[PDB]
């Protein structure tokens, strides 16, 4: 038996956590917070024919910059061709990495209610010398039947690599909506 | 008598539906998802004197592109002069249309707590040949006393026309914050 006051308390705490980037964890991969993509060491951006800006000025693609951007309506993803691809992000701050968060559009928002283009198995690599060969921080697999946002728990790093090894079966590309990196700053 | 666990379950389901574009329906009119406006076949954009960018470079208006954009803070609307006006959007995908969704700023956010500039009676038209004279998919009237977001239930189409026949009484213009089109893709 729960009282009214305890219902108001439970929703107020739940809207606070919602308002706190949905999962209440600082994101050191968040561009506005001062992170950037090593655009040279990212997978080739699948750009193809699609979006023209007019008056035909210009063909529109999605830079990998967006995987570090919060807006995750459908289409606001970075897309590479095939089921393998990678990105190297310089975190806003040298931290000891404790978790990553991946997120895809909800099925209810995506047509035919399937999210074929989402990443399946991925892996995370630290790069001690920003310079070096990656140190495997951990492998995980994003769960197409899971929630849109899923966070995954595992030395300080400022450069990290999200490596996607498989996708959930799209024959042409893989979309990455948002990638996050959590952890504690050094002492 | 409800238990704690059932309160947590009910709010978790409610925040999921909230996070899912508020109503959990794919939007084939959503630009980022690959929809566009037939800018030639849209009502004349009421632009008047208002917003200058400096150093006076430039006068700022709101393209009809925004009615297919999610941001719905006050002012992020497309505005035409008078109480009649129309827009033709090419849906991201040929679908059999089953519903549309209109949405206006909440009264609590709008000054003097009234939303005089909102659309009243509207209508929806398919255009089989993207080319053709519209096929009336259904008439509805947006309810100024309703909720900000209101969705309305009714052949495949990719081109659809939102036709506004009256507004809720603004003497100068009508603002359109967001227009959505739901349905099922063809087989």
């Amino acid at each position: 038996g729960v009282t009214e006051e305890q219902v108001h308390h439970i929703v107020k705490q739940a809207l606070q956590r919602y308002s706190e980037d949905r999962i209440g964890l600082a994101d050191y991969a968040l561009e506005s917070g001062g992170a950037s993509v090593i655009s040279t060491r990212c997978s080739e951006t699948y750009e193809t024919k699609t979006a023209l800006l007019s008056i035909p000025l210009w063909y529109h693609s999605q830079s990998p910059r967006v995987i570090l951007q919060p807006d995750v309506h459908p289409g606001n993803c970075w897309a590479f061709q095939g089921p393998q691809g990678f990105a190297v992000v310089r975190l806003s701050a040298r931290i000891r990495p404790t978790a990553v968060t991946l997120e895809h559009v909800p099925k209810a928002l995506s047509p035919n209610s399937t999210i074929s283009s989402a990443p399946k198995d991925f892996a995370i690599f630290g790069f001690d010398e920003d310079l070096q060969e990656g140190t495997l921080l951990g492998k995980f697999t994003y769960d197409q039947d899971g929630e849109p946002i899923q966070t995954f728990h595992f030395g300080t790093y400022q450069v990290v690599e999200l490596r996607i090894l498989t996708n959930w079966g799209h024959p042409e590309y893989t979309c990455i909506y948002r990638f996050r990196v959590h952890g504690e700053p050094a002492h | 008598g409800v238990t704690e666990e059932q309160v947590h379950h009910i709010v978790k389901q409610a925040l999921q539906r909230y996070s899912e574009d508020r109503i959990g329906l794919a939007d084939y009119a959503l630009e980022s998802g690959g929809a566009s406006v037939i800018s030639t076949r849209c009502s004349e954009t009421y632009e008047t004197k208002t917003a200058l960018l400096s150093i006076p470079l430039w006068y700022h208006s709101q393209s009809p592109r925004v009615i297919l954009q999610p941001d719905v803070h006050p002012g992020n609307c497309w505005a035409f002069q008078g109480p009649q006006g129309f827009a033709v959007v090419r849906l991201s995908a040929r679908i059999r249309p089953t519903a549309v969704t209109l949405e206006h700023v909440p009264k609590a956010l709008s000054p003097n707590s009234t939303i005089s500039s909102a659309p009243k009676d509207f209508a929806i038209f398919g255009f089989d040949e993207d080319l053709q004279e519209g096929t009336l998919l259904g008439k509805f009237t947006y309810d100024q006393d309703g909720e900000p977001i209101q969705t309305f239930h009714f052949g495949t189409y990719q081109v659809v026309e939102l036709r506004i026949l009256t507004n809720w009484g603004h003497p100068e213009y009508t603002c359109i914050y967001r227009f959505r089109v739901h349905g099922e893709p063809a087989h």
Binding site: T50, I55 | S32, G34, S61
Partner: peptide
Amino acid sequence: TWPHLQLCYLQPPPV
């Protein structure tokens, strides 16, 4: 004086 950049889709974008 009033501006507008046009967006159109020749194929469905990555989604």
